[PDB]
Amino acid sequence: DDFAKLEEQFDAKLGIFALDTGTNRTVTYRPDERFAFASTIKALTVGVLLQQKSIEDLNQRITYTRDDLVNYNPITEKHVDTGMTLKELADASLRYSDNTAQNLILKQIGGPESLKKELRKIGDEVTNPERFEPELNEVNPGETQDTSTARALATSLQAFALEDKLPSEKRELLIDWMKRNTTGDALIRAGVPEGWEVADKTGAGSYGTRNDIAIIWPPKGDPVVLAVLSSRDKKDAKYDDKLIAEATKVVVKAL
Ligand SMILES: *C(=O)C1=CN[C@@H](C(=O)O)C(C)(C)S1
Numbered sequence: 001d002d003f004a005k006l007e008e009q010f011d012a013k014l015g016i017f018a019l020d021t022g023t024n025r026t027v028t029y030r031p032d033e034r035f036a037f038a039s040t041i042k043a044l045t046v047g048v049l050l051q052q053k054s055i056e057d058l059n060q061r062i063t064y065t066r067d068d069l070v071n072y073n074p075i076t077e078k079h080v081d082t083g084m085t086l087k088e089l090a091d092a093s094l095r096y097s098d099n100t101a102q103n104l105i106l107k108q109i110g111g112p113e114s115l116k117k118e119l120r121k122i123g124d125e126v127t128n129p130e131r132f133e134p135e136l137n138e139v140n141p142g143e144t145q146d147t148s149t150a151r152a153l154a155t156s157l158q159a160f161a162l163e164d165k166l167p168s169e170k171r172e173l174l175i176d177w178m179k180r181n182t183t184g185d186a187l188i189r190a191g192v193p194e195g196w197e198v199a200d201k202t203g204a205g206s207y208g209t210r211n212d213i214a215i216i217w218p219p220k221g222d223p224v225v226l227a228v229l230s231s232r233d234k235k236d237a238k239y240d241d242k243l244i245a246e247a248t249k250v251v252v253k254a255l
């Protein structure tokens with residue numbers, strides 16, 4: 001088995017769920033195994049934001065201080081004095097994985113508990129958000145806090161991006177931001193053939209957790225929804241992006 005060999009090569013545990021929405025063909029490997037979701041939660045968080053906010057609501061300017069800044073603020077740290085609109089925060093969260101942006105958006109939808117309730121409402125009984133960034137990235141073996149599964153993350157991404165959980169213009173917004181992600185060049189994007197379009201959100205967490213969730217479009221026909229999650233034995237383990245790229249190639253061959 002190709003996934004098993006990847007786990008051996010990269011000394012990592014893999015979680016895979018892929019669905020061809022045109023055929024209902026799937027590729028799965030430990031699809032119900034829990035992993036820390038890390039920054040991938042940012043995608044579902046914008047999903048819920050878009051359920052609740054009108055387009056003009058996204059123009060609201062959010063003021064914050066140097067004190068609101070956490071550990072990874074590539075865009076937010078450059079706009080303390082002027083603030084950022086919710087739309088700009090969504091852009092920074094999704095495309096740069098800006099942690100302060102995620103936190104500010106989280107507050108707008110009522111925090112982790114509210115995020116969890118809204119995910120439960122769309123049929124996600126698995127994803128378990130409890131914390132803000134960056135604390136959420138740190139999950140110990142056996143814990144379910146701030147974890148989900150490949151199946152549940154893929155299904156929730158599918159719900160917001162492809163299904164009627166959002167109206168078409170809002171689905172388009174989410175997809176456009178994700179298509180233009182800056183952080184995923186070495187992951188799912190690196191494992192698809194030429195001509196395939198990718199809308200992804202990455203994550204990295206403790207125990208060398210390295211994730212990417214995506215909608216991918218072949219040149220012709222219906223989109224594929226894919227979650228590729230991974231973790232390792234040691235708390236301070238480094239990850240290798242190639243694991244995700246190679247796992248994606250396996251999924252592409254199998255479909
Ligand atoms: C999301 O998974 C992450 C976000 N921001 C950074 C952080 O330090 O928290 C990353 C290392 C990219 S992980």
Ligand SMILES: [Cl-]
Nearest residue numbers: 039097202203
């Ligand atoms: Cl990330």
